[PDB]
Symmetry: D3
Subunit: 107 residues, 6 copies
């Protein structure tokens, strides 16, 4: 296993419906090995002077690091927001079989 060659990408969505549709798509298109959805999220950010709170859903998408650009482009079309949160974190170590599986199902 090459350190950081698999990544865990985080994507924020407005609701569960959208998150599922994106999640299903990225897997079906082989852009990700799998996705975890974390619901009941409260996002806190500053907008036009004031601080806003919204209900959101968070995706943890596990994929090859080489696919992150392609994953990001896809998430950009489908347009959850004008500017979509996509951040990829590199996996330094882990369960080799599983890490090999994430590669095998995205080649």
């Amino acid at each position: 296993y090459v350190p950081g060659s698999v990544s865990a990408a985080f994507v924020t969505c407005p609701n569960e419906k959208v998150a599922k549709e994106i999640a299903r798509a990225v897997v079906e298109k082989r852009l990700a090995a799998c996705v975890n959805l974390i619901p009941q999220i409260t996002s806190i950010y500053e907008w036009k002077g004031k601080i806003e709170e919204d209900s959101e859903v968070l995706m943890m998408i596990k994929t090859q690091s080489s696919l992150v650009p392609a994953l990001t482009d896809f998430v950009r079309s489908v347009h959850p927001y004008e500017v979509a949160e996509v951040i990829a974190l590199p996996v330094e170590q882990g369960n080799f079989p599983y890490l090999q599986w994430v590669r095998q199902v995205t080649e």
Copy 2:
């Protein structure tokens, strides 16, 4: 985009009220671009020889990596706990406009 110049910091809180107070403060103080709150967390650790379980709330704070020390100091200063969990994970890749936005709103 410089790899790892934006970070995702994780902070554990005793409840939603405290997590929201801290979240609103770090954004208002420009120490973070935004905060995701993940509720209904069960924390499992050892204390006085026994293994404890607590209800907690988890913050995923997205900010510049250069601000993490300042972020930590602030959280230290206001957090209820004697020793606050603050761990920062570097963002290797992502949506450039979003990554640019995180920098823009924290300069």
Copy 3:
């Protein structure tokens, strides 16, 4: 603090019961300083032709990076799934006292 010498490892479980059992074990065995359990997770993956959805629980395990191989072996052994998700993400910066604590409670 040496950058990346503490890691946050993520492990997916079928349910709360199993997640708690594994969480308690890794702490008791000093393989992790602490574990956060994130419930009500929906996992989306391909199940041999179909796209599947399951209810799962997610563990965020905080430990020394040197212990991740030992943590994985243990999880491997007692995990239901044939192939367990264990992914470790390195902590670049943080609260030094806390980072020191994670090391203190996992030394042997």
Copy 4:
């Protein structure tokens, strides 16, 4: 000190004269704090399936990681080779004063 916010960039040159010109330029332009020149290098690469050996000089350029794109653009512009070797390696730890100095003289 933020890990990896200073980098050590390596640049290959055909000879000492060119390396010095580039080295002096990047420092005068504040794109680097300083440059170490390693002479008497033998470079070994293929080209049309045949293996070449050339005399080269290697630069180790120490600078902010945020300046690496700007550094690379400049080196592209003045380097005799069509495709210039510029590779940046991040500095995880070091002498803080010196790391602080590299930042101070490139701001």
Copy 5:
């Protein structure tokens, strides 16, 4: 470019002849894009209780990070020393064309 997907590997050799043989081989076998040889090295380490000084030559081998294990195997197998120094350092940023070239000639 995926951060850290190209590496610069350093290998220590007893002399120029050996270093060149190994260098030519790894390039010919497509295990590396190119190799820089840094001569006139003095190595300082402890041997049988006393501190030794040897004349050595240092290789900086630029290749895909995915190839480092294969590179190491080859070197370990051919290298004079029982335990060969092979250390790989990841390239976080650089000249994209050149980084693309390193991949192209090693696929």
Copy 6:
């Protein structure tokens, strides 16, 4: 092998005499497994707004990453310059036996 748990630290010295003295000391004190000296270096930096060129020697010091702070403290203490260049680069991959050896001889 834990990625980045061994580091290659670079230290600049005014001449070979000093470099050898420091190199011998860090090895004898178990702060490093071994040191490569790269001589005939030309350093280019700015000083009182004027660009200087000096003859220097470069050390590549291979050690545990956990020891880098202790290594730096020692170097700062024996090093002639007021502000010593010490930069540590993490080793992501390599020859495991050798990586194991660097740890063995510095425990």
